[PDB]
Amino acid sequence: KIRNEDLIFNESLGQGTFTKIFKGVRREVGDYGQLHETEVLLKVLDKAHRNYSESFFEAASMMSKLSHKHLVLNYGVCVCGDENILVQEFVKFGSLDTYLKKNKNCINILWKLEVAKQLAAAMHFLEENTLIHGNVCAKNILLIREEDRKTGNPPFIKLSDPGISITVLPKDILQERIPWVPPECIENPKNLNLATDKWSFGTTLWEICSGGDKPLSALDSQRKLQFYEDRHQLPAPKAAELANLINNCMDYEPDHRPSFRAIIRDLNSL
Ligand SMILES: N#Cc1ccc(Nc2nc(N)nc(Oc3cccc(C(=O)O)c3)n2)cc1
């Protein structure tokens, strides 16, 4: 819980679902009483959508009861003014979807495998804690550190918070989030379960293999609906080394989707 007076808003970085995102600075007393001015990620709920404030905050709160090297750090909230603001660590290299687009001509199978293994590790941690994320996608993966072939250092990613839950979002927004949202949640958003994240994880691997293309982007909401109704799978990406794993995770039967331990074992065997 942070004071408005300790936060300075700077440039807009974009928007999420019913939110606006800004780079910012938090003035804080840190360890040993040292004063720090810390770059922060600020997510502001749209005032016009103040109805979603509880879910907006339950999303960040749920994940911050657990600590983990691959889960993004949340500093707190500022409920100052009429604004609802999430204060989050600022990651140097932004989200994975934009990173994959701007760097497509420099991302090989080894880089992808390390990113997929780290994301599976985070999801395995969540599965063991029976915590549903609900919005696994490339936009919610943050790149802390780039790969450095010189020092052999692999990339390092974190999973960000899910945003407002699909269990309260309007149906046309859910439909636009096909194929990250699983078919059982399109049928009924309250079908959100651990198996939800395995499907979305599969969709996210497709993103990682497709240079930041969005799967099914050419299809409007009604065609996305019918895609599920006809039980189609995503096309294999040209870089097809993860296609079987993608299809295994994107199983129309939720009970058949493999555990993240089995997913990690599959990744390790490639
Ligand atoms: N250029 C650049 C750049 C560099 C660093 C960040 N840092 C950061 N940090 C955190 N915790 N979360 C995010 O989410 C976002 C939100 C909006 C857009 C994007 C994106 O990739 O454009 C990412 N971004 C963001 C952008």
Q: How would you describe what is shown here?
A:
This protein is of the alpha+beta class and about 270 residues long. The chain folds into two domains: about 1-90, no CATH class; about 90-270, no CATH class. The protein contains nine helices and seven strands. The chain has helices at about 55-65, 95-100, 110-130, 170-175, 185, 195-210, 220-230, 245-250, 260-270; strands at about 5-15, 20-30, 35-45, 75-80, 85-90, 140-145, 155-160. The strands form two sheets. The chain has a five-stranded antiparallel sheet. Strands 6-7 form a two-stranded antiparallel ribbon. Helix 3 (about 110-130) runs antiparallel to helix 6 (about 195-210) and helix 3 packs antiparallel against helix 9. The longest helix has 20 residues, at about 110-130. The chain is globular and about 55 Å long. The chain starts with 6 loop residues before the first strand and ends with a helix. About 35% of the residues are buried. Ligand VPS binds near residues 13, 95 and 98. Ligand VPS binds near residues 88 and 89. The PDB classes it as transferase/inhibitor. The entry lists the keywords pseudokinase domain, inhibitor, complex, transferase, transferase-inhibitor complex. It forms a monomeric assembly.
